[PDB]
């Protein structure tokens, strides 16, 4: 850019100014080469899996050393929420399944079971989700009283399940891994309302993730009080291959 | 309350509440138009405070007791805490919302330029209606950001510039819960979409009162427009 | 396959506690174990106080709220800065029945939703208490004739600043129809979390001169007059007191943050001072030494890191100026009280009861307690002029008192609790080798990460970038060698070689990295596409540092 | 210039809605009354833009113009000079 | 002062002779002059970029010698005011802070901070815990181990 700042307000008004007619270019794709969808899909996982594969596992053997710290974050009812450039997926896989899940069994004497959520899948529902947690939990049903007038029953049991959960001890029942919780069917405020709810419980651990840089935006006072999250950067420049696929790629 | 003051201090007595009641006509008929509601809503606010203003020597002389009760028939008198950063958040907004972006960088910009380069002009001729007195214009969240950067209050490791952490997101969040500043769409809202823009939602007296409890000298931001 | 899908249960198949040895992993287990003993002790005596400050909150609102309801027009209370959490309880007075009714902004669309909730809730109740009706008003007027009782019901508006105005100003206006029917009267209750001026402007004039007939204020905020905030700062206090200080910086950090927070402050008080005790008893292997019956368990590690400290240094300086020694100093010069707590509390009972100053912070006159600047705090009032020598306090900068505090020098309060999200994603994006280490060796020294590469490419150029010359920008920065090198090092797999064989290899190969790095860059919000089936120019969304 | 109280804009905003209920002021691309009750019901469901934005900015459209008040007004009042444009 | 002065005529060898003045060698020297050399024009005043460029590459440099004495940075700071005949020490500041900017993202300015571990003042081992939030990250709150045998040495003495 002919331009004088880069950054802040400076970069933004600077590299904001109205360039002329003649001075744009009318370069397209029709001058770009053609690709198939295979050579793309073959390129590109060989790219993932030799392309800085040493120092991304030696960066990921370095995070590792954090999950005692994650697991005595999680006993005390934050809930992590995990950013960075990169996928974060197989990360919150490992920790939740492979360390987190015994540790916690082990220190309240099956394992403890880990519902994960796929929020770059964006048929993502908070109904059958909430399915699953009542099959999990098994909460009591609401009475008539309790349905009101037309209500929104999810979110009336999830309250009843608060004020249930308020006076039993404080073991964590059920592991919540949400990837992605800025996806394009969770970030939805019904979905964050049902989440951050679920967050109050102390019974359940949630770990999150998160992938765009406006995410902060999703939560409100309330919200952010609800959620109670301890941030932590897990930066990796991990390729997401699995998140890929959910998007068309090649238009 | 009359009859407490009476003896604090028949036909009297009505003709000082027909005075009254004539007084709160003529005083406020253009406010209320020919509304029984209305005048006798303010008949019902304006009594006892007449009445307490009665003395031994205000009862025989209507006009004593009018210069008495001057401040009751002048006007009408039907009426009945928030954070720096959602302070200057509604500030930057109401500047978003109020003013043109190509004209931005000939107010706000202010740095030293090591690269040869040409800062904006500045408009050129003035409005000629007031565009506060319009509806608000929408704009995107960095704009927001830049303007809310450039306004907010402050060597080798300081850096001493707010950036755009969680707070600031979380105050820009509660504003919108508010209703302080709105969208373009008001249900089944996705805030991380690039095509929702943002506007202000308040009018001119709440943001001048807004900056008058910081401050910020907004006014000479429109002052040299129009 | 389980990344398809939206969601799935997994139980692990399985085959004690989450603080490490610290001193190098020369730590024992059993000091390990007592440093969380001590700091489950900690945090209960904390959070004991704290839900018996929280009880007390809501007991004295009730109260307040319960006076100001019950001592032919409505009766209105405005509750001022209310996250409209309260659970308000009427009371039970015979011959006469009270019903709460609660109405949301979701729970009302329009007036007849809103009246329809409204009437089903008063029939529930009142059959709950002691025929189907038509849920609408009639059954305010055929209450006394139905149920034998008069009626008082409370309307109880929940977060009034979310609420489509027209629909509330139409549903009094029809709610001031039942005051003829000389059995019923009507309480309204509004949440309000800006401004009665903005509920003003939003409302009817006629609206307002009905509201105004008899109408009280009532300001019930998370912090009103500092009065709840200073109870569990001096909890706080009180279960660190002779056994742990808190740094100036630590308390400015605490000021700050409770100042950029309205509503919700007093969560997040509790929320930095348990984590900043958590990340004490995470860190600090002398935390055992909170606790004065381990002092014997020394050992040379701890006194060789004890020996490290500034208090200490300047002392051992004075000293020389002017082992076994160095243990007695160490277990005799850790029992004093540190009396700057009972001071503050000494303070904050004299200013409260004897001067009836009320509008007074503990926390910022703990920092000047902390700093020396008690009477410069204490002369904002000109009250205590005749007592400015009475008050007058100088901390004593005891030594090693920094092996048991809590002070904020790292960010690590900054980057776990508020951290510079966006920043730090840019930071990273530009800055990768602070991310990636530096240890097919040739190619990761010779060309970076293409997120790192397409973000530097991308901060250096305009607003509107045409992606075509996005794309041999690029290109012109990677080698060429080294990637046909580098992707002629898998002999198993052949269509990689068949692909290599091309000459248009590098091209492709360029094309693949740009478009998975530029749909990233669509991902997380960094650049948007013009148009839907155009897809030839982007728009820079971020920049970095605003 | 050539003497009338000269009313806030505190106080015109009574004026305002009272000229609004009397038919004189209606909201800019209002349907207003529905047929049936089916779009009735349809409209009774959605929230106007009009009703979401402060009363000082809300756009209106006469229903009778200046030529008529000028036709109307007598000749003795004083504000028949500004009927004229 | 030499940071007012617009569009000076620099020889490729004062560049050269301003370098040799920091101690820096012929790599990083060079860099910065072929760094001058590729923004000559599109400049303002010269002496801000190059005065940026030498500093922002002295801390990097000698950034072994910045931790064990805090006072080298004020003299390098005060040997600059002075090169450049201005009494504010906030204008050098300025000028690396702006020169900064310029040269965060650059291969060259990477590997400087690649081979001395420089990492803005910070080493690897420490600035990846400082990433990560880590607890057990070091606080710069006790005294370095070195700098503490090197006060126990200058006791011995």
């Not at chain 1, 899996?49 to 994650?70: A, D, T, V």
């Not at chain 1, 403890?112 to 699953?132: A, M, Q, T």
């Not at chain 2, 006509?25 to 209305?38: P, R």
């Not at chain 3, 997040?268 to 600090?284: A, I, V, W």
């Amino acid at each position: 850019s002919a331009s004088s700042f880069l950054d802040t307000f400076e970069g933004y008004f600077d590299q904001r100014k109205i360039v002329r007619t003649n001075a744009k270019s009318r370069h397209t794709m029709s001058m770009a080469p053609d690709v198939t969808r295979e050579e793309f899909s073959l390129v590109s996982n060989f790219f993932n899996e030799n392309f800085q594969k040493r120092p991304r596992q030696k960066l990921f053997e370095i995070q590792k050393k954090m999950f005692p710290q994650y697991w005595f974050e999680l006993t005390q009812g934050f809930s992590l929420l995990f950013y960075g450039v990169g996928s974060k997926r197989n990360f919150l896989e490992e920790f939740a399944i492979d360390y987190l899940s015994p540790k916690i069994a082990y220190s309240q004497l099956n394992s403890i079971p880990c519902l994960i959520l796929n929020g770059y899948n964006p048929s993502c529902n908070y109904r059958d989700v909430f399915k699953e947690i009542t099959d999990l939990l098994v909460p009591a049903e609401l009475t008539r009283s309790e349905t009101k007038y037309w209500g929104n029953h999810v979110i009336l049991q999830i309250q009843k399940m608060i004020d249930f959960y308020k006076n039993q001890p404080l073991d964590i029942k059920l592991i919540l891994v949400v990837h992605n919780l800025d996806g394009p069917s969770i970030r939805k405020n019904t979905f964050q309302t049902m989440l951050s709810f679920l967050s109050v419980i102390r019974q359940i651990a949630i770990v999150a993730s998160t992938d765009h840089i406006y995410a902060p935006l999703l939560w409100d006072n309330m919200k952010a009080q609800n959620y109670n999250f301890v941030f932590h950067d897990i930066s990796n420049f991990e390729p997401s291959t699995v998140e890929s696929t959910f998007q068309d790629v090649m238009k | 309350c009359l009859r407490k003051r009476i003896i604090e201090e028949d036909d009297q007595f009505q003709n000082v509440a027909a005075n009254f009641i004539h007084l709160i006509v003529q005083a406020f008929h253009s406010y209320t138009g020919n509304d029984i509601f209305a005048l006798n809503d303010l008949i019902d606010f304006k009594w006892p405070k007449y009445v307490s203003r009665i003395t031994k020597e205000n009862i025989f002389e209507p006009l004593a007791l009018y210069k008495s009760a001057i401040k009751l028939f002048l006007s009408t008198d039907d009426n009945l805490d928030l954070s720096i950063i959602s302070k200057y958040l509604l500030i930057a907004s109401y500047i978003c919302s109020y003013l043109e972006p190509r004209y931005d960088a000939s107010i706000f910009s202010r740095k030293t330029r090591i690269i040869q380069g040409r800062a904006a002009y500045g408009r050129r001729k003035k409005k000629e209606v007031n565009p506060r007195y319009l509806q608000p214009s929408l704009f995107a969240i960095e704009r927001l950001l830049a303007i809310f950067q450039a306004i907010f209050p402050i060597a080798l490791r300081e850096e001493s510039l707010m950036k755009a952490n969680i707070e600031v997101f979380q105050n820009l969040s509660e504003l919108h819960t508010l209703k302080l500043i709105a969208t373009t769409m008001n249900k089944n809202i996705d805030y991380l979409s690039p095509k929702v823009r943002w506007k202000v939602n308040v009018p001119w007296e709440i943001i001048k009162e807004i900056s008058e409890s910081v401050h910020f000298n907004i006014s000479d931001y429109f002052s040299d427009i129009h | 396959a389980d990344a398809q899908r939206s969601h799935y249960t997994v139980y692990p198949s399985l085959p004690h506690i989450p603080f490490v040895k610290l001193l190098s992993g020369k730590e024992s287990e059993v000091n390990v174990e007592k440093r969380w003993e001590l700091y489950h002790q900690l945090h209960s005596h904390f959070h004991d106080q704290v839900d018996h400050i929280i009880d007390n909150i809501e007991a004295d609102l009730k109260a307040e709220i319960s006076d100001l309801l019950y001592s032919r027009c409505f009766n209105t209370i405005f509750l001022l800065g209310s996250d409209s959490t309260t659970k308000i309880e009427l009371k039970d007075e015979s011959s006469r029945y009270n019903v709460l009714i609660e109405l949301t902004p979701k729970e009302s669309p329009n007036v007849r939703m809103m009246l329809r909730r409204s009437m089903y809730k008063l029939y529930s109740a009142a059959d709950a208490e002691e025929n189907d009706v038509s849920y609408d008003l009639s059954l305010v007027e055929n209450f006394k004739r139905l149920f034998g009782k008069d009626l008082a019901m409370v309307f109880n508006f929940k977060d009034v600043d979310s609420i489509n105005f027209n629909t509330l100003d139409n549903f009094i206006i029809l709610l001031k129809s039942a005051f003829k029917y000389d059995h019923v009267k009507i309480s309204l209750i509004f949440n309000i979390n800006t401004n009665l001026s903005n509920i003003e402007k939003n409302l009817r004039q006629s609206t307002i001169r009905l509201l105004k007939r008899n109408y009280h204020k009532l300001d019930v905020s998370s912090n009103k007059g500092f009065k709840y905030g200073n109870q569990i700062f001096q909890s706080f206090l009180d279960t660190v007191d002779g056994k742990l200080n808190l740094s100036d910086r630590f308390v400015e950090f605490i000021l700050s943050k409770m100042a950029n927070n309205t509503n919700h402050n007093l969560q997040l008080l509790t929320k930095m001072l348990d984590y900043s005790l958590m990340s004490y008893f995470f860190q600090n292997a002398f935390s055992v030494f909170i606790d004065p019956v381990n002092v014997d368990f020394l050992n040379d590690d701890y006194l060789k890191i004890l020996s490290r400290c500034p208090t200490f240094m300047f002392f051992v300086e004075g000293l020389i100026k002017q082992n076994r020694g160095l243990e007695e100093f160490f277990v005799e010069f850790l029992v004093r009280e540190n009396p700057i707590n009972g001071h503050a509390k000494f303070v904050a009972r004299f200013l409260e009861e004897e001067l009836n100053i009320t509008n007074f912070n503990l926390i910022e006159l703990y920092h000047n307690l902390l700093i020396g600047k008690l009477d410069s705090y204490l002369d904002r009032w000109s009250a205590c002029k005749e007592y400015k020598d009475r008050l007058h306090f100088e901390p004593i900068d005891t030594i090693f008192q920094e092996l048991f505090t809590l002070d904020n020098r790292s960010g690590l309060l900054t980057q776990s609790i508020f951290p510079s999200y966006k920043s730090n994603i840019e930071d990273n994006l530009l800055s990768w080798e602070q991310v990636l280490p530096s240890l097919s060796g040739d190619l990761d020294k010779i060309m970076a990460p293409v997120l790192g590469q397409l973000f530097k490419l991308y901060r250096e150029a305009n607003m509107t970038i045409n992606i075509y010359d996005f794309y041999i920008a690029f290109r012109e920065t990677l080698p060429k060698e080294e990637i046909l090198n580098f992707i002629r090092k898998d002999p198993s797999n052949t269509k990689l070689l068949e692909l290599a064989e091309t000459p248009d290899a590098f091209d492709k190969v360029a094309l693949i990295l740009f478009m998975q790095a530029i749909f990233a860059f669509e991902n997380m919000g960094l650049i948007k596409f013009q148009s839907t089936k155009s897809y030839d120019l982007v728009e820079k969304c971020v920049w970095r540092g605003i | 210039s050539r003497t009338i109280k000269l009313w806030l804009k505190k106080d015109v905003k009574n004026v305002w809605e009272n000229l609004v209920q009397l038919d004189f002021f209606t909201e800019k691309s209002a349907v207003g009354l529905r047929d049936n009750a089916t779009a009735a019901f349809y409209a009774s469901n959605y929230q106007f833009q009009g009703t979401m934005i402060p009363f000082d900015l809300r756009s209106y459209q006469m229903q009778i113009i200046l030529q008529e008040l000028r036709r109307i007004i007598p000749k003795s009042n004083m504000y028949y000079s500004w009927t004229q444009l | 002062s030499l940071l007012v002065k617009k569009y000076c005529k620099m020889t490729t060898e004062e560049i050269i002779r301003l370098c040799n003045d920091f101690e820096l060698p012929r790599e990083v020297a060079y860099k910065i002059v072929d760094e001058y050399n590729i923004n000559a024009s599109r400049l303002v005043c010269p002496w801000q970029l190059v005065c940026g460029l030498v500093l922002n590459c002295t801390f990097i440099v000698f950034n072994e010698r910045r931790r064990k004495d805090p006072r080298i940075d004020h003299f390098i700071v005060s040997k600059m005011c002075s090169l450049m005949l201005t009494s504010k020490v906030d204008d050098v500041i300025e000028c690396v802070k702006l020169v900064k900017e310029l040269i965060i993202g650059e291969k060259w300015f990477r590997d400087l901070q690649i081979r001395y571990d420089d990492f803005d003042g910070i080493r690897y081992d420490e600035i990846i815990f400082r990433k990560l939030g880590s607890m057990l990250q070091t606080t710069n709150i006790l005294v370095t181990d070195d700098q503490y045998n090197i006060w126990k040495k200058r006791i011995e003495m």
